[PDB]
Amino acid sequence: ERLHYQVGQRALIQAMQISAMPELVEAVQKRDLARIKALIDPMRSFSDATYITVGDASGQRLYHVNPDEIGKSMEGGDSDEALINAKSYVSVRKGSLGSSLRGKSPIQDATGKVIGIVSVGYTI
Amino acid sequence: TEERLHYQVGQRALIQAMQISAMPELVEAVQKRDLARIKALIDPMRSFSDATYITVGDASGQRLYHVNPDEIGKSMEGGDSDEALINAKSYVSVRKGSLGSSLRGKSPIQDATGKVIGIVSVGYTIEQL
Ligand code: NA
Numbered sequence: 680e681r682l683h684y685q686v687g688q689r690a691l692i693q694a695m696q697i698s699a700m701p702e703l704v705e706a707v708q709k710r711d712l713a714r715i716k717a718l719i720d721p722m723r724s725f726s727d728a729t730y731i732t733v734g735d736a737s738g739q740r741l742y743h744v745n746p747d748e749i750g751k752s753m754e755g756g757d758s759d760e761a762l763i764n765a766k767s768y769v770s771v772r773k774g775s776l777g778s779s780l781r782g783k784s785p786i787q788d789a790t791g792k793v794i795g796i797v798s799v800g801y802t803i
Numbered sequence: 804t805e806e807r808l809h810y811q812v813g814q815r816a817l818i819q820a821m822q823i824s825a826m827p828e829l830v831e832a833v834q835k836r837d838l839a840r841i842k843a844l845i846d847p848m849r850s851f852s853d854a855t856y857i858t859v860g861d862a863s864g865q866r867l868y869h870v871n872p873d874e875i876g877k878s879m880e881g882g883d884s885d886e887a888l889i890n891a892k893s894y895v896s897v898r899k900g901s902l903g904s905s906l907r908g909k910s911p912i913q914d915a916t917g918k919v920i921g922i923v924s925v926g927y928t929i930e931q932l
Pocket residue numbers: 694695698699767784785786787
């Protein structure tokens with residue numbers, strides 16, 4: 680149906696655009712959690728998304744809306760297509776914040792190697 | 804009340820313009836007027852979007868980047884950039900640009916003092932809706 684397609688498209692384009700920012704690639708390479716927060720807090724401000732998560736190459740959270748969730752594993756079971764196969768896609772799963780529609784895209788270094796992931800989501 | 808597709812396309816156009824205009828990389832490239840560096844940042848942003856175009860203008864609305872390189876160095880078209888360039892507002896608008904009628908989201912680019920130094924416009928031609 681049109682609604683979940685249209686919202687999914689908005690989520691996916693944010694994930695693809697944000698994950699490609701040279702500043703974020705570098706902050707992830709350095710594991711600089713404060714710099715990641717400085718980059719993503721404004722991106723959430725300017726979006727109607729419920730959340731934006733950043734994970735490292737193993738799907739451990741580098742940034743979450745709730746700081747207590749940083750340093751724990753991402754939830755829902757739908758990150759491997761981005762982390763392993765470098766695909767960008769829409770998915771629906773139940774994370775820590777409840778059931779949501781999310782767009783996901785890998786973060787990649789200069790060689791193409793996956794170093795992280797961005798997930799941008801809207802609760803149902 | 805706006806029709807569903809009108810609203811949904813406006814929302815993603817507006818969010819792209821707000822997000823892209825706030826990227827530290829683009830703020831610096833605009834400050835330095837480095838046209839090659841602007842191109843290097845915006846080309847990938849367009850490749851990852853269903854938008855018809857993305858235009859970047861300086862503080863006076865002269866184009867620093869356009870999908871048609873022949874349009875770089877000429878004034879933006881439509882007459883709907885002042886609220887962003889002067890009042891620092893972000894909004895959705897409909898006007899005829901060089902590419903034909905389009906629905907576009909606009910947002911200012913600002914330096915660390917809040918001063919407006921440019922504009923991002925992300926748009927969808929009506930023909931293509
Ligand atoms: Na990506």
